[PDB]
Every structure is written in structure tokens, then in C-alpha cells.
Amino acid sequence: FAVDAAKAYKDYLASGGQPITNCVKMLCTHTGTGQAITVTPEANMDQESFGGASCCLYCRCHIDHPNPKGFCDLKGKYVQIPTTCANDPVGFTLKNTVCTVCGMWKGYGCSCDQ
Amino acid sequence: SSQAWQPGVAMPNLYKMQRMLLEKCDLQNYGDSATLPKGIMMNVAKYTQLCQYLNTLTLAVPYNMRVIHFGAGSDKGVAPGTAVLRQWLPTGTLLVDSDLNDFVSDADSTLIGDCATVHTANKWDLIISDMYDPKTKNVTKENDSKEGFFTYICGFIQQKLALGGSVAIKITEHSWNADLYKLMGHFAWWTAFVTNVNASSSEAFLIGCNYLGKPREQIDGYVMHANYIFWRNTNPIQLSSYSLFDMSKFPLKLRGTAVMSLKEGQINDMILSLLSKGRLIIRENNRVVISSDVLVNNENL
Numbered sequence: 001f002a003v004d005a006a007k008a009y010k011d012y013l014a015s016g017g018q019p020i021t022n023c024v025k026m027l028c029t030h031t032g033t034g035q036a037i038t039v040t041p042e043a044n045m046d047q048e049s050f051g052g053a054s055c056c057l058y059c060r061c062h063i064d065h066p067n068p069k070g071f072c073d074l075k076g077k078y079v080q081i082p083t084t085c086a087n088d089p090v091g092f093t094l095k096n097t098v099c100t101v102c103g104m105w106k107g108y109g110c111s112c113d114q
Numbered sequence: 115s116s117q118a119w120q121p122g123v124a125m126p127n128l129y130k131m132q133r134m135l136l137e138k139c140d141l142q143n144y145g146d147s148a149t150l151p152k153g154i155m156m157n158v159a160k161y162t163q164l165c166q167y168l169n170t171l172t173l174a175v176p177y178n179m180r181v182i183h184f185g186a187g188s189d190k191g192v193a194p195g196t197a198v199l200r201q202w203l204p205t206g207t208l209l210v211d212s213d214l215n216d217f218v219s220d221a222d223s224t225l226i227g228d229c230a231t232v233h234t235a236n237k238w239d240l241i242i243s244d245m246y247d248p249k250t251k252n253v254t255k256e257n258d259s260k261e262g263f264f265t266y267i268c269g270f271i272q273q274k275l276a277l278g279g280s281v282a283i284k285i286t287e288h289s290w291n292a293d294l295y296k297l298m299g300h301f302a303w304w305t306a307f308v309t310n311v312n313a314s315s316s317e318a319f320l321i322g323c324n325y326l327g328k329p330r331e332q333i334d335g336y337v338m339h340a341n342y343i344f345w346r347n348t349n350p351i352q353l354s355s356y357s358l359f360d361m362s363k364f365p366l367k368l369r370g371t372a373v374m375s376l377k378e379g380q381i382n383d384m385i386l387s388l389l390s391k392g393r394l395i396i397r398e399n400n401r402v403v404i405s406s407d408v409l410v411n412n413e414n415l
């Protein structure tokens with residue numbers, strides 16, 4: 001037995017629940033590389049940059065991280081979120097995946113399959 | 115007025131030289147609010163302007179820099195100020211933060227508890243504090259120097275700030291401490307800095323730049339706070355978020371400032387001069403180890 005927080009938030013959102021708020025949006029140039037998860041803000045024109053911890057479902061809900069290591073991919077880093085999705089950064093990070101070669105979000109920057 | 119395009123306003127030197135009596139703080143712009151960029155929190159804007167101002171000083175910035183941030187939690191359970199500090203500081207800087215109340219942070223390590231419980235083996239290159247108790251804002255009682263976490267801060271600086279290091283400690287009209295002002299005379303330079311986004315508040319950051327470990331100047335902290343209030347009372351500051359829109363030069367330059375370990379008898383005037391210029395840090399370069407004291411109680415039957 002183990003709580004499945006990810007699924008719960010996804011279902012809560014589909015049920016019409018209000019997205020997790022108070023994610024920490026950063027001031028930046030918006031001329032960055034546009035990669036998904038970086039050591040400093042890297043939003044491009046089409047993105048917002050957020051402090052990573054505040055966008056991590058596990059950090060924010062005080063629950064163990066989905067990793068035998070329990071390491072947090074986002075804490076201490078910055079996450080770039082497409083501006084069109086920046087109303088729900090936590091949902092975005094959960095529902096999406098980072099291309100492991102170019103560092104962009106699959107479908108929101110990753111041009112590797114071209 | 116030029117000022118609106120700065121990150122904020124620092125207390126002009128002539129005001130520091132006065133001998134004013136403490137009065138009530140009555141700000142003309144009290145109730146004004148700056149227009150923050152869309153979706154940006156006050157605490158992000160405020161820390162951004164603080165860091166933009168610190169970029170103009172002669173901060174020591176060594177490799178393996180160590181920064182500690184007190185009062186870093188929010189009622190929202192996140193740490194916006196820590197997120198700005200980590201953006202500003204060189205990658206790899208060791209950042210520790212703390213607060214009385216639980217929060218999640220981008221710091222490398224976070225301690226939850228009264229600051230008085232926080233201990234560290236190592237010395238630090240930069241101390242930031244936003245600790246504050248809004249109960250101090252009581253206009254019906256005399257405004258005397260406060261103790262509490264300010265007593266901790268003064269001791270922590272004297273015991274754990276590296277020579278050459280700097281501090282930025284948040285104060286307000288009622289949240290202040292006379293010894294902390296006196297301790298500003300132990301730095302090569304000091305000021306009280308008001309962010310332009312929060313200029314409608316009596317808040318400032320008391321900044322001590324390049325710690326010398328001894329008095330360079332004898333400051334009476336009761337008089338200095340009265341001087342600070344006199345400045346605020348007679349110099350309205352226009353609310354402004356202008357500086358937030360240009361982040362191209364935001365990152366703190368990694369200067370690679372030298373770190374040396376020296377004993378009291380070794381701090382000559384040439385060393386003191388290097389310290390004063392932001393060119394030297396004096397501390398052990400050992401591993402960073404911190405802890406929080408935990409009071410144990412058993413209240414069964």
C-alpha cells in the first residue's frame with residue numbers, strides 16, 4: 001500500500017479542482033535556453049520560470065518522493081513552464097516529461113523527433 | 115527621479131551623521147502600492163531589488179561561498195526570498211535557510227525552529243534575515259529597542275560571520291535593535307536600504323558591508339534609528355517596480371575572492387584594508403555543518 005498523490009491531483013483537477021497555487025515565479029530576462037529544468041532561470045519568450053521546490057507535488061504536499069532515493073528533481077533548481085500552462089505549474093510538471101538528450105519538454109520545445 | 119529607476123534608496127550619509135530624537139514614522143506614500151509585473155509576488159520583487167542593490171557594493175564572493183537566510187518561510191509554506199537568493203548567488207553557493215514555521219525551500223538545507231536553536235560549526239560569507247513579528251507594529255506603546263531574535267542575530271554575526279563578509283537584516287519602525295546598529299560600525303561600510311517596491315513601508319534592510327570584527331566607528335543605535343526614521347519621515351520614496359524589468363545584469367559576479375585562515379594577531383592594517391575593499395574573506399574552509407536544538411518533553415500521565 002502507498003498513496004498515489006500524482007493520480008489524486010490529476011483526478012482532483014479533472015473533477016474541477018483549483019490548481020495548486022503559490023508556486024514561486026521568478027523575474028528573469030525571458031531570453032534563456034528554454035530547457036525544462038535548469039540551475040538558474042532559463043525561460044524564453046514563451047515561458048515562465050519558477051522555483052523548483054514550489055512546483056514539486058511531493059515537496060508541496062509533504063510526502064515522500066517517487067524515487068527509492070527520494071531525491072527531488074525540482075528542489076534547488078528552476079522549472080520552465082509554457083506561459084499558457086503557468087496557471088498550474090505542478091500539474092504541468094507531473095503530466096509532462098523532459099527529453100533526456102536536448103533538455104526540453106517533450107512537445108513544448110523538443111525537436112528531436114524531426 | 116533617477117531614484118525610480120534604481121532598485122531602491124539607501125540612507126544618505128548626511129542623515130547618518132545627525133543626532134535626531136526618535137519620532138513616530140508617518141510615511142506620505144503609506145498605502146500606495148507599486149504595480150508588480152503580472153504574477154510576481156511582493157517577496158520576489160523585494161528580494162530582487164535587495165540583490166540588485168547588493169550588486170553595487172563590494173561584497174566578497176569566494177568559491178565555495180556560504181550564505182545563511184533567516185526568516186525564510188512564508189504563510190504560504192514556500193520560500194520566495196530563498197528562490198531569489200539562489201538565482202542571484204553563483205551556482206554551487208551553499209545556501210542554508212531557516213524559519214520558525216515549516217516551509218519548503220530551494221536551499222541546500224533548511225532548519226525549522228526558533229533561530230535561537232540554530233547552531234553552525236562554520237562561519238558564513240553572507241547573512242540575510244527577514245525575521246519579523248508583526249505584533250511589533252503597535253503604535254499605542256513606546257518604541258523601544260527590541261531583543262528576541264535580534265539578540266541572536268547580533269551574537270551570530272560576532273561569532274559566525276567571516277571577516278570580509280556582509281549582512282542584510284530587515285528592520286522596520288518598530289522592529290529594530292540598538293546593538294545591531296552599533297554593530298554596523300564594525301563593517302567597512304553600512305547603510306539602511308529601502309526597496310522601491312515596498313517604499314510605502316517603514317521596512318528597510320540594514321546592510322553591513324565587509325565585516326572587520328572590531329569597531330571602526332562608535333554608533334549609538336538609539337540615535338541611529340532615530341536618524342533612520344527622520345530620513346524616512348522627510349524623504350518620501352516613490353513606489354517603483356521599474357528595476358524588476360531589467361534582469362540582464364542580475365547574477366552576482368563570481369569574483370573568486372581569496373579565503374584565508376588567520377589568527378587575531380595576524381590581522382594587520384594591510385589585511386584590514388583588503389577586507390574593507392571586498393578582496394578577502396577570513397575563515398576556516400572546512401565542511402559546512404549545521405544543527406537545530408530540539409527540546410524533549412514527555413507529557414504522558
Ligand SMILES: NC(=O)c1cn([C@@H]2O[C@H](CO)[C@@H](O)[C@H]2O)c2ncnc(N)c12
Pocket residue numbers: 184185186187188189212213214215227228229230244245246247248262263
Ligand atoms: N521571534 C519572531 O517573531 C520570529 C519570526 N520569524 C519568522 O520571520 C518571518 C517573517 O515574519 C516569519 O516567517 C516568521 O515565522 C522567526 N523565525 C525564526 N525565529 C524567530 N525567533 C522568528
Ligand SMILES: [Zn+2]
Pocket residue numbers: 053056057058059060065072073074075
Ligand atoms: Zn520535491
Ligand SMILES: [Zn+2]
Pocket residue numbers: 099100101102103104110111112113
Ligand atoms: Zn529532445
